[PDB]
Amino acid sequence: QTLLVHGKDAQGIIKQVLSEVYDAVTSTMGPNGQLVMIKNGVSTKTTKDGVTVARSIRFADEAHELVNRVITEPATKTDEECGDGTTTTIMLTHALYHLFKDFPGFQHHRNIEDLVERVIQRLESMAIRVEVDDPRLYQVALTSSNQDEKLARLVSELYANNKGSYPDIELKEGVNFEDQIEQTTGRTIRMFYANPWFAKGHQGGVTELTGFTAFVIDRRIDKEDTQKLIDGVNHLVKTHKQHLALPILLIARSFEEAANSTLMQLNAAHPTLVEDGRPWLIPLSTPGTSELQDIAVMLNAPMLSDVADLTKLDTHSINGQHGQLELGGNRSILKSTTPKDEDRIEQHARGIEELLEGFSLSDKFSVRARYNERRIRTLRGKLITISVGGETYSEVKERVDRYEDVVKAIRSALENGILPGGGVSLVKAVFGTIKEGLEDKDQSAEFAKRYINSGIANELMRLSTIQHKLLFKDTALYKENGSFHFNDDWLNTPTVMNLATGEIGTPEGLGIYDTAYASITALKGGLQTAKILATTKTLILGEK
Amino acid sequence: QTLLVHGKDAQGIIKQVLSEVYDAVTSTMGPNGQLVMIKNGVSTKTTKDGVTVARSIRFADEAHELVNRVITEPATKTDEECGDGTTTTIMLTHALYHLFKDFPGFQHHRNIEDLVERVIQRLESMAIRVEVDDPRLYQVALTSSNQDEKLARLVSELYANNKGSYPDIELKEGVNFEDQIEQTTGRTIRMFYANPWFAKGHQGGVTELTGFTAFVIDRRIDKEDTQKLIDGVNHLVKTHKQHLALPILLIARSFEEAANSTLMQLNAAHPTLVEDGRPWLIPLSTPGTSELQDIAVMLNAPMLSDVADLTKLDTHSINGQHGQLELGGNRSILKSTTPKDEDRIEQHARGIEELLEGFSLSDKFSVRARYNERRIRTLRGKLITISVGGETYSEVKERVDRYEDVVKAIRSALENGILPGGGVSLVKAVFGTIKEGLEDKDQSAEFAKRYINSGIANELMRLSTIQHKLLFKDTALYKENGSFHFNDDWLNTPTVMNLATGEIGTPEGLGIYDTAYASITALKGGLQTAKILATTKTLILGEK
Amino acid sequence: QTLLVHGKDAQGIIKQVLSEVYDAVTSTMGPNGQLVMIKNGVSTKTTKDGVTVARSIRFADEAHELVNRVITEPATKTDEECGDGTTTTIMLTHALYHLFKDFPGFQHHRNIEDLVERVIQRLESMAIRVEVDDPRLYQVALTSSNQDEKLARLVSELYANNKGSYPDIELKEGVNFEDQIEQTTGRTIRMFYANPWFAKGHQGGVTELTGFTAFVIDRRIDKEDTQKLIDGVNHLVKTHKQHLALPILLIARSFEEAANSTLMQLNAAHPTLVEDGRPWLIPLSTPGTSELQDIAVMLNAPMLSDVADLTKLDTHSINGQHGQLELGGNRSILKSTTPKDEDRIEQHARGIEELLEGFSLSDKFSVRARYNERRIRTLRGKLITISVGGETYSEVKERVDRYEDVVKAIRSALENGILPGGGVSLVKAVFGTIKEGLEDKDQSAEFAKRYINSGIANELMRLSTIQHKLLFKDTALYKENGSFHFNDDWLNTPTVMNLATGEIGTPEGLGIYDTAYASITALKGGLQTAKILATTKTLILGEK
Amino acid sequence: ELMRLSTIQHKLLFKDTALYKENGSFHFNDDWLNTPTVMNLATGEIGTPEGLGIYDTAYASITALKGGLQTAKILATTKTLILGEK
Ligand SMILES: Nc1ncnc2c1ncn2[C@@H]1O[C@H](COP(=O)(O)OP(=O)(O)OP(O)(O)=S)[C@@H](O)[C@H]1O
Ligand SMILES: Nc1ncnc2c1ncn2[C@@H]1O[C@H](COP(=O)(O)OP(=O)(O)OP(O)(O)=S)[C@@H](O)[C@H]1O
Ligand SMILES: Nc1ncnc2c1ncn2[C@@H]1O[C@H](COP(=O)(O)OP(=O)(O)OP(O)(O)=S)[C@@H](O)[C@H]1O
Ligand SMILES: [K+]
Ligand SMILES: [K+]
Ligand SMILES: [K+]
C-alpha cells in the first residue's frame, strides 16, 4: 500500500518485530529451554538450538522482514566465527534498545556508548586464562556436550598428553561401535588441486608422494601469465635437472582454466619424467598473504612475487625435499618431517610468538592477534583423525556434531579466555564499572553527572540482570523472598543454580563457564545493532 | 496467515489435534471395535486395523498436520519391527500428556520420567517365557487370528514337532483348495544377484547348483576396486585350478555397475569353464558386519577384509564345497549340507549362544541381543514353504496375511515374552511399583515425598486403568456397581471379559495374552512422544 | 471442508443416503412400478429395471457417494450371477438397518444375526423343486416376460421335448419376421483361439474340421516354456506320424505372445501337412481346473500337468478322433460324436452326479455344487440356436433381451428351487422360525429370553411384511379394514393380488413364483451390508 | 472425594502463603493427622491450632455441615423452575 513509512509508524513496527523475535529465541536459552517445531516443506525440525531458530524465522509482510534481517545476520555471523553466542546477542539487542528509548537527546546516546564501551574493557580485563594440565577443561567439555562421560574424558586427555604442541582434531564417519584414534604428525596445510587432472588416476584422487620440490607464488595466475610458465618450467627441467626431486609443486593463490590447460601440455611435453601415471607438475590453490609464507617455510620453498622469477634461480634457492606429502581435493597433508626441517619451522614459529609477546592487552584479543595464533597451530601441532562410531548410522552423524562442538569450544577456551557463567560475568562487569569511576576522586565530578545522576547507571545495572532472570526465573533460587537481591554480599560470592543437576552454588564451584569471546562479541554486536534500530526513523519498500 | 505460532495458541492446537486422533484410533481397539471407511481415490477401504487408520489420517491445515506427524511416525515404526501395538501407543500418548499438564515445574517432569522408567523395569521382570511343547502357543495363535481352528492348530504343531531347531515359515500363493507343506532343510540366506546377467538364462533366473567355492568380502565394491578383481580372479583360475569347484561366488556388501561390467568380461575371458550357459563367476550383494561372518561359516568361505587379499591365498584357506545351493533374485537357499559342515555351523551357533548366556537381564531385551538371536535362526532352523490355498483368488491373498500375522506373533512370543492381556499387565506393574518403594523402609522417606504425597502415583494409577476401561466399558463387567473397583482383591486374581465368547474369568484362564515387546515399546515410545508434545511451546510453518 | 467425519455425523449421513436410495429403487418394484428418466449425456433412458436404477444413481458430495458405493456393488453383483433380485436386496438393507438401530449392545447384534441365519435355513428347506414335464414352467415364463403368449409356449415345449438332457439356448439377430430354430447336438465348449493367425484365412475365422488329435495342458504357457514346445511337437510329428489325425490341438489355460510366435514358426517348419491353408497346430485358451478335465473327456485327450510330458507319450495315450469340430473366436462347438465316445462322456457325467447324490442339504445350494452342475450341462445337453425375428431392427434387439431373461429364469428355476411370490415366502419363513423355537420345549427357555421377550421377534415379523406392503398398498386388497391382518388363518392360505390381471387368490393358484436363489441371496446380502452400515461410525475422505 | 472436600476450608485460608509455597500442593498424610500444622494469619508464625490459639465453636461448624447437606441436596435434585405469578 505505502512503500514510504515515516514517523511513529516505523519505530512502532521496529518494536513490534523485535518483541516477537525476542520471545521466540530467548525461550530456547539454557538446558531447561522449550522446543520449537520448524517446518521445511514436509519434514518437522524439532530443535532447541538458538542459531537455527534465528535463521529459520520468516514473516508475512515485507516491512516486518526488512527489520528482521537487521537482527538476524549479525547474530548469524557470531556462530560462523566463534560457534556460540546468538541468543545472548539477541537478548541484549532488546535490552539496549529499550535503554536508548528512555534517554533521548543525541548527547545521551553518546554517554550510553562510552559507558558500555568501558564495560567491554572491564570484561576483557576480567578474562581468565587456563592451561592444558588444569582440570577445568573437563568441566567445560561436560557443560558444552550436555553431560557425556566418554566424550569429555577423551578430548581432555588428548590435549593433556600433548603438552607443548596444540593438537588439531578432525572427524570422519566410522563403521565400528568403538571409537578409533590415529596419533600421527600429519601437518595440515591449506593447499589443494587446481584441476582434477593433476592427481593420481587423473580424476582428483588422493596422491601420496615421497619427495618433492615446492615453489610458492604470490600472484593470482590467469591467461596473461601463460607465457612465463612455459619459460620458467623448461628452464628448471633443462638447466637444473641434477638438483631436483619429482614432482614439482607450483603453489599459488588461484589458478584459472586458461593456465591449467597450458600446464597440462607441459606435462605431456616431457614424458620421460612421468613415473607410474603421476604428472610431474602440479598447480595448487589456496583461499592474508602470510599464510603462503608458512607454506614456504614448511616445504623449504623460496618465496616468489612474480611468475618471471622462476627463470632467475640457483642451487642456493632451489631445495628439493625428501620427506612425505599427501595431496588432496580438499587439503594437503605433510606427514614425514626430518629433524633438520623441524628446526627451521620451530624457529619461524618463535618469530610469530615474539610478535605476540610485544602486543598490548587490547591488541591481544583483536583479529590481528587471532590470525597470527592460527598460523602457529598450522606450523606446530599434531593431527589426530578420530573415526566416530555408534549403534546406528543416524547416531554416528549426530555424535560427529557433538564431537565438533567440544573441539571448537576447548580450542577457543585456551585461546582467548573463560568467564563465570549463569549471567554473572556481565553483572560483575557493570557493577564494577559504576563503582570504579565513582570511587576515583579525580573524575567523580563528571562521572556522576553523566551516568549515575542522570540514571543511566541505575538502568544499566538492571539490564545486566536480564540473563540471570531468564535462566533462573520460576526455580528454587528465585522462589525465596519474591525477587532477587543484588547486594554487595552477592557480588563477593555469586550464587547460581546448575540446571542439569539441581544443586545451588558458585559458577566456579559447580563448573558453569562461558568463553570470553562469545560474551564480548554479543555485547559489542548488541550495542551497534541496538543503536541502529533506535536511530532509524524511516523505511523504504519500493523496488527500483 | 501467521507462520509463527507461540504461547497458549500452540498448546491449544496440540491438545486439539491429539484429541481428534485419540478418538479415531482408540475406537478400533479390540474385536468389539467399530469400523472406519477410508477413501483412496475411488475405492472404499473399510478396516478395523489400527496402524492403517493412523497412517491414513489427513488434516486440512498445515499446523494440524505438523502435529499429527509427530504422533503418527513413532506409532507406525512399532508395527514395522514388532507387528503389533499402535493403538495402545497412541492411547498412552494422550494419557501421559494429560499427566504432564497437571504437574508443572521441570523438577516434576523429572520425577514423572523416573517413576515411569521404574514401571518399565517391573514390566521387563514380569515377562514370562514359554516353550514349544507348552499348549499356550495354540491360545495365542487362536487370539491373534480372530478364532480359526485349522490355522492355529497347524502352526502350533509345526513348532512342536521340530523340538530344538526353530522353524522358519515362508508363504506363497496356492492353486489347490487344501494347503500343501514342504518339510525341507533349505537353510535361508541373505544373499542375492548383483546383476541379472549372472543367473541361468542371463535374465535373473533361479540358478540351482551342485558344488561351489565361496569367498566373502567385507568392503563395498565400486570403480576403484576394478583392478584388484582382475588380479584376484586370474590368480585363482591359473594357479589354484586343481582344488576348485565351479562356480566361484564373490559374496560382498554392495556391487556397483562399474564392477559388474568388469566381472562380465572376466567370464567371457575364460570360456572353457562355462558349463551349459552358466557363468562361472557370480557377484552377490547383502543389505551389522557379523551377518557376513555367518555366510562365511555356512559355506566354509574365508573372511576377507580387502579385495587385494584374493591373490595371497592357499589350499588351507580355499575350500570348494560339494553340497547344493539355489541362487535367487530376492534370496539364496542352501539345501544339502554334509554332517562335517553341520558340525562347524552348530559350534559357531553355540558361540553366539554362550555370549547370550553371559548377558544381563536388561541387556537380554535390547537390540544387541535380538540381533544375535536373529543370527541363530539363520544358522540353525529348517525352512518350511506353505502354499496357502482357498476357494477364490481374493481369499488366498487374504489368508496369506492371516498366516503371516500368526507366524510373526508366535516367533516373537517365544523370543521375548508373554504377559496377561485385557490391560491387566500395565495395572499390575503400576500398583506394584508404588507398593514396592513405599514398603521398602530405606527409601520410603523420599519415595513418598516425590511421587505419592505430591499425587503423581495416584494419577498414574488412574492412567493404567485406561486400557481396561476402553475395552470393557458398556459390557457385563462394568455394568455392576457403577464404576470398577481396583482393590487388593482384584490385584491377586484379576478378572476380564473375553470379547469373542462372552464369558468372564482371568486372562490366564480364558487365554488372553499380549507379547512383551509390544506393551513395553508402547510405554517407552509413549513417554518420549508425550514429553515432546508437552514441552513444545512453538510452531513454525514458513517454508525456507 | 472436513475429511475426517466422526460421531453422530457419520450415522446421520448414512441414514440420509440410505433413505434416498430406498425411495428411488423400491418405487420401481413390480409391474405396477413408476418409471425413472435417466440422462446419459444427451439421450433419455426411461426404464423400470431396478438394477439399471441402482447402477446409474450419482450424488454431488463425496461423503454421500462413498456410502452409496457400499449399497450399490453388492446389489449389482446379484444380477451378474443370478439375473434377478436387486430391489428386494436394497429394500431389506433399509429394513435390517432399522432393526440394528433399535437394539443396541453388541450382544443384541449377535442375537439378531443368529435369528436371521435360522430364517435363511428355513427358506432353504422351504425350497420346492420342479420337473420339465410340469406345467408350472409356463407360469414362470409368462410372469418373467411380462405376459407373452408365443415366447412362454416355445421355450416351455423346448425343455419338455428334450426329456433327459437339459437343452442350452443361444440367441442371434434374425432377418425374417418368423422365428427359426436349429435342433442340433452342437456340444458347446469353453475353448477359443489364442491368436487370430491359427484360423482358416489367417484372420480369426470360423474353422470347421472333420478329424483332430487334442492334447490338454494344465499350466499357463509363456516365454519360459518355448523350448519344451519345440521338443514335444517335433517328437509327435517324427515318431508318432502313423497314428495321427490332423490338426493337432494344444488346449491350455493361457497362451502368451512369446509362445504363439514360436508355434507359428513350427507350422511353417513342416509345410507338407498344411492342407488348403489350414495350420496343422492350434493353441487354445480357456478363462477351477476340472473344466479342462471335461474338455479332455469330450475329445478323448490325455490330461497333462507339465509341458515336458508331450515327449513321453505312446499309442495307448495318443488318440486321434474322427468326429466333427468347429473352432471359433468366442467358443468352439463339437457337433458329430460317435456312440463309442458318448459312452465315455455319459459315464464321466454319472461320476459327477454320484458326488452330488452324496452331498448334504446345505451343501447342495453352495457354490461347490452349482459349479459341478455347470459341468454336467457342458457335457450332456443339446445346443439350440434361435435366430430371433421381428418387424423392425429395434424390436429384434429388444426381443433378444426378452428371450435371454426367459432362458436364464427357466434354467435357474429347475436348478435351485421355486417359492411362492408376492412377498409371502419371507413372511412364512419368519413366522415359522419364531413358532418352531417357541414350540420346542427343550430350548424354549433361552429362545424366548433372547428373541421373543426382548422384542426382536416382534420386530422381525413386522419387517417381513415390508415386501407385501409395498406391492399391494393402495390396491383392492389393502383397502378393506384399514391395515392387513397377519393371523394364523392367513398363514395357512395366503392371499395376494395379481397386478397384471387384477384378480385375488393364492400365489400358487394365480401363478406368481420367485426363484429360490434370488430371495436367499437378497437376505444373505442384506444382513451383511446392513450390519456394516450400522456398525460404521467413521468416514475418511482425504486422498493419500 | 469426601476427603478432598474437607481440604477446601484449609486450601482457601492458606493458599498463596508460606505454608502452601513449599512442595507445590499440601500433603495430607498420617503424620499431619497426628500433629496438624496451620498458619496464624494475624501474626505470621507457624504451628498447631492448639499451640497458636485458633479455635472455633462447636455449634457453628456442625450447623454449617448440617445446613450444607440439606441445601446441597435440594439444589442438586431440583430439575424444574416456575416464574409465573398466579
Ligand atoms: N548447566 C547449566 N546450568 C546453568 N546455566 C547454564 C548451564 N549451561 C549453560 N548455562 C548458561 O546458559 C548460557 C548458554 O547459552 P545458550 O543457551 O547455548 O545460548 P547461546 O550460546 O547464545 O546459543 P547458541 O550460540 O546457538 S549454542 C550460558 O551463557 C550460561 O550462562
Ligand atoms: N478376545 C479378546 N478379549 C478381550 N480382550 C482382547 C481380546 N483380544 C485382544 N484383546 C485386548 O486388546 C488388545 C489388542 O490390541 P489391538 O486392538 O490389536 O490394538 P493394537 O495391537 O495396538 O493394534 P495393531 O497393532 O494395529 S493389530 C490387547 O492389548 C488385549 O489386551
Ligand atoms: N404379476 C405379479 N403380480 C404380483 N406380484 C408380482 C408379479 N410379478 C412379480 N411380482 C412380485 O414382485 C417381485 C418382482 O421383483 P422385481 O420388481 O423384478 O424386483 P427385482 O427382481 O429385485 O428387480 P430386478 O432384479 O432388477 S428384475 C417378486 O418378488 C414378486 O413377489
Ligand atoms: K543452548
Ligand atoms: K485390533
Ligand atoms: K421389476
UniProtKB/TrEMBL annotation, chains A, B, C:
Belongs to the TCP-1 chaperonin family. Belongs to the chaperonin (HSP60) family. It comes from Pseudomonas phage EL. Mg(2+) 2 binds at residue 84. ATP 1 binds at residues 30, 50-51, 85-88, 422, 467, 498-499, 514. This is Putative GroEL-like chaperonine protein. Mg(2+) 1 binds at residues 49, 84, 405. ATP 2 binds at residues 30, 50, 85, 87-88, 422-423, 498-499, 514. Keywords: ATP-binding, Chaperone, Metal-binding, Nucleotide-binding. ADP binds at residues 30, 85, 87-88, 422, 498-499, 514. One of its GO terms (molecular function) is ATP-dependent protein folding chaperone. SUPFAM superfamilies: GroEL apical domain-like, GroEL equatorial domain-like.
